[PDB]
Amino acid sequence: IAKVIYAMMGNKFVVDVDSNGKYVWFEFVLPGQPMNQGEIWKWRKEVNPDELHIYISENFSRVMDRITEHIKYHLSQPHESNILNYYKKLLKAFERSKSKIFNDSFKKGVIRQAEFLFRQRSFIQTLDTNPHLLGVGNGVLSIETIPAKLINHFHEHPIHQYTHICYVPFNPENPWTKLLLNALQDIIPELDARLWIMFYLSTAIFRGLKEALMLLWLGGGCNGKTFLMRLVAMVLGDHYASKLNISLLTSAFMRLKGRGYGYFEETNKSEVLNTSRLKEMVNQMTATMVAASNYNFIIDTTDHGTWRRLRHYRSKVKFCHKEDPRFIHEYIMDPDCQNAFFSILVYFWEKLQKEYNGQIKKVFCPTIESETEAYRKSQDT
Amino acid sequence: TIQLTAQRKYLAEVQALETLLTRELSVFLTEPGSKKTNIINRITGKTYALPSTELLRLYEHLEQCRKQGALMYFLERQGTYSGLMLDYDLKLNTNAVPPLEPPALSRLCHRIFVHIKNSSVLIHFFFTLKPEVVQGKYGFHVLIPGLKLAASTKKSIIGSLQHDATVQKILHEQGVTNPESCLDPHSASVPSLLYGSSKLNHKPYQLKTGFELVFDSSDPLESYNLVSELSLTNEQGSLVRPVDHSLSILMLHDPEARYLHKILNLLPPEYYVEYPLWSNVVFALANTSANYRPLAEWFSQKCPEKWNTGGKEKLEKLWNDASHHTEKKITKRSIMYWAHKHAPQQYKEIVEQGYFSILAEYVYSYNGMLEHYMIAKVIYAMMGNKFVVDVDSNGKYVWFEFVLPGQPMNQGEIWKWRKEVNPDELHIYISENFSRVMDRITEHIKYHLSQPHESNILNYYKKLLKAFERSKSKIFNDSFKKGVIRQAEFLFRQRSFIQTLDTNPHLLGVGNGVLSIETIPAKLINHFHEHPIHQYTHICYVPFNPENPWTKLLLNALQDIIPELDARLWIMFYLSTAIFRGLKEALMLLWLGGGCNGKTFLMRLVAMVLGDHYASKLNISLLTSAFMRLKGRGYGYFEETNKSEVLNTSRLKEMVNQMTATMVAASNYNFIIDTTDHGTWRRLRHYRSKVKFCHDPRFIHEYIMDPDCQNAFFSILVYFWEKLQKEYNGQIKKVFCPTIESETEAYRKSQDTLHRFITERVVESPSAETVYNLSEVVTAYAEWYNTNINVKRHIALELSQELENSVLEKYLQWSPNKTRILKGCRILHKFETLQPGESYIEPKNKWWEWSPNP
Specify whether the CB–CB gap between B320 and B355 falls below 8 A: no
Q: Cα separation of B213 and B124, whole Å?
A: 6
Name the phi and psi angles at B672, rounded to 5. Answer: -85, 120
Task: Output DSSP code: residue B672.
Answer: B
Specify whether the CB–CB gap between B437 and B370 falls below 8 A: no
- Which positions ≥6 away from A37 have C-beta within 8 Å? A137, A164
Specify whether the CB–CB gap between B86 and B141 falls below 8 A: yes
Task: Name which of A203, A139, A201 is nearest A169 in CA terms.
Answer: A139
| Packing angle of the helix pair A2-9, A104-118 (nearest 10 deg) | 60
Contact: A318, B814; criterion CB under 8 Å: yes
Q: Would you list the DSSP string of B571-627?
A: HHHHHHGGG--S-----EEEEE--SSSSHHHHHHHHHHHH-TTTEEE--HHHHH--G
**H or E stretch at B478:** helix B478-492
| Packing angle of the helix pair A335-355, A225-236 (nearest 10 deg) | 90
Q: Cα separation of B191 and B71, whole Å?
A: 19
Please state whether beta strands A289-293 and A310-313 pair in parallel, antiparallel, or not at all (unpaired).
unpaired
Helices (H), B206-311: 226-230, 245-251, 255-264, 270-273, 275-288, 293-302, 304-306
Within 10 Å of residue B455's Cβ, how many Cβ atoms? Answer: 7
Please give the residue of chain B at the shortest CA–CA distance from A245. B654
Q: Which residues in B have their CB inside 8 Å of a CB on A?
A: 15-16, 18-19, 22-23, 366-367, 369, 371-374, 391, 395, 483, 486-487, 490-491, 493-496, 649-650, 653, 657, 678-679, 798, 801-802, 804-805, 809-810, 814, 818
**H or E stretch at B387:** strand B387-391
Q: Is the peptide bond before A158 cis (omega within 30 degrees of 0)?
A: no
CA distances from A162 to A141, A152, B367 (A): 10, 14, 48
CA distances from B294 to B245, B285, B336, B684 (A): 9, 10, 20, 59
Specify whether the CB–CB gap between B789 and B753 falls below 8 A: yes
List beta partners, residue B840. Answer: B763
Q: Is the peptide bond before B738 cis (omega within 30 degrees of 0)?
A: no
Q: Cα separation of B271 and B276, whole Å?
A: 8
Resolution (A): 4.0
Instruction: For B21-49, give one letter per residue: b (16+ CB within 10 A) or e.
Output: eeeebeeeebeeeeeebbbbbeeeebbbe
* Angle at the Cα of B398 from the Cα atoms of B394 and B400, rounded to 5 degrees: 145
Specify whether the CB–CB gap between B506 and B517 falls below 8 A: yes
Tally of residues, chain A: 381
CA distances from B111 to B107, B116, B319 (A): 6, 9, 60
Q: Is B688 annotated as a binding residue?
A: no
Q: State the amino acid at position A216 in one-letter form.
A: L
Q: Is A233 left (phi over 0), alpha (psi -120 to 50) or beta?
A: alpha
Within 10 Å of residue B618's Cβ, how many Cβ atoms? Answer: 21
Q: Cα separation of B260 and B336, whole Å?
A: 9
Name the phi and psi angles at B204, rounded to 5. Answer: -65, 155
Task: Name which of B105, B150, B156 is nearest B126 in CA terms.
Answer: B105
Instruction: For B662-678, give one letter per residue: b (16+ CB within 10 A) or e.
Output: bbbbbbeeebebebbbb
Chain B residues lying within 8 Å of A222, measured CB to CB: 809
Tally of residues, chain B: 854
- Coil vs helix vs strand at B449: helix
Specify whether the CB–CB gap between B579 and B614 falls below 8 A: yes
Number of helices and strands in chain A (H, E): 14, 11
N-to-C CA span, chain B: 73
Q: Cα separation of B237 and B228, whole Å?
A: 7
Task: Name which of B61, B76, B43 is nearest B234 in CA terms.
Answer: B76
Specify whether the CB–CB gap between A334 and A159 falls below 8 A: no
User: Which method, experimentally, gave rise to this model?
Assistant: cryo-EM
Q: Cα separation of A121 and A200, whole Å?
A: 38
Contact: A220, B805; criterion CB under 8 Å: yes
Name the phi and psi angles at B848, rounded to 5. Answer: -70, -40
Within 10 Å of residue B384's Cβ, how many Cβ atoms? Answer: 15
Option in A54, A221, A295 nearest B490 (CB):
A54
List beta partners, residue B662. Answer: B635
Q: Would you list the DSSP string of B184-217?
A: -TTTTTS-B--TTBPPTTSPPPEEEEEEE----S
Q: Cα separation of B636 and B122, whole Å?
A: 103
Specify whether the CB–CB gap between B19 and A69 falls below 8 A: yes
Residue B228 C-alpha from the chain's centroid: 53
**H or E stretch at B74:** strand B74-76
Q: Is A36 annotated as a binding residue?
A: no
CB pairs under 8 A between A and B: 71
**H or E stretch at B10:** helix B2-10
- 3-state SS string for A44-105: EEECCCHHHHHHHHHHHHHHHHHHHHHHHHHHHCCCCHHHHHHHHHHHHHHHHCCHHHCCHH
**H or E stretch at B541:** none
- Which positions ≥6 away from A236 have C-beta within 8 Å? A163, A165, A205, A260, A261
Specify whether the CB–CB gap between B777 and B787 falls below 8 A: no
Task: Name which of B685, B683, B686 is nearest B655 in CA terms.
Answer: B683
Specify whether the CB–CB gap between B33 and B74 falls below 8 A: no
Task: Output DSSP code: residue A27.
Answer: E
List beta partners, residue B826. Answer: B763
Burial of B100 (0-12, 13-18, 19+ CB in 10 A): middle
E strands present in B428-581 = 507-510, 513-516, 523-525
Specify whether the CB–CB gap between A101 and A60 falls below 8 A: yes
Instruction: For B399-430, give one letter per residue: b (16+ CB within 10 A) or e.
Output: bbbbbeeeeeeeebbbbbbeeeeebebbeeeb
Helices (H), B728-805: 738-751, 753-761, 775-788, 798-804
Contact: A102, B486; criterion CB under 8 Å: no
Task: Name which of B99, B100, B188, B194 is nearest B147 in CA terms.
Answer: B188
Q: Would you list the DSSP string of A110-166?
A: HHHHHHHHHB-SS-STTTT--TTEEEETTEEEE-SSSSPEEE-S--S-------SSP
- Coil vs helix vs strand at A315: coil
Burial of B578 (0-12, 13-18, 19+ CB in 10 A): buried
Please state whether beta strands B387-391 and B206-212 pair in parallel, antiparallel, or not at all (unpaired).
unpaired
Contact: B496, A36; criterion CB under 8 Å: yes
A108 touches B: beta carbon within 8 Å: no
Specify whether the CB–CB gap between A209 and A304 falls below 8 A: no
Q: Cα separation of A328 and A313, whole Å?
A: 22
Mutate to test the interface with B, among A29, A39, A40, A57 (most CBs of B within 10 A): A57
CA distances from B828 to B678, B785, B801, B825, B833 (A): 22, 14, 21, 10, 7
Please state whether beta strands B387-391 and B397-402 pair in parallel, antiparallel, or not at all (unpaired).
antiparallel
- Compute the Cα dihedral for B812, B816, B819, B822 and give only its sign: negative
Specify whether the CB–CB gap between B620 and B641 falls below 8 A: yes
Q: State the amino acid at position B209 in one-letter form.
A: T
- Which positions ≥6 away from A356 have C-beta within 8 Å? A199, A362, A363
Task: Name which of A220, A203, A317 is nearest A269 in CA terms.
Answer: A220
Specify whether the CB–CB gap between A284 and A310 falls below 8 A: no
CA distances from B441 to A175, B7, B259, B359, B448 (A): 64, 16, 20, 7, 11
Instruction: For B352-368, give one letter per residue: b (16+ CB within 10 A) or e.
Output: eebbbebbbebbbebbb
- Which positions ≥6 away from B436 have C-beta within 8 Å? none
Specify whether the CB–CB gap between B644 and B672 falls below 8 A: yes
Q: State the amino acid at position B769 in one-letter form.
A: E
Task: Name which of B827, B395, B56 is nearest A20 in CA terms.
Answer: B395
* Angle at the Cα of A34 from the Cα atoms of A28 and A35, rounded to 5 degrees: 55
Q: Cα separation of A136 and A342, whole Å?
A: 10
Percent of chain A that is helix, strand, coil (3-state, to 5): 45, 10, 45
Chain B residues lying within 8 Å of A317, measured CB to CB: 818
Task: Name which of B365, B358, B376, B377 is nearest B468 in CA terms.
Answer: B365
- Coil vs helix vs strand at A242: strand
N-to-C CA span, chain A: 76
CA distances from B331 to B40, B282, B402 (A): 37, 11, 16
- Compute the Cα dihedral for A76, A79, A82, A86 and give only its sign: negative
Q: Cα separation of A136 and A167, whole Å?
A: 6
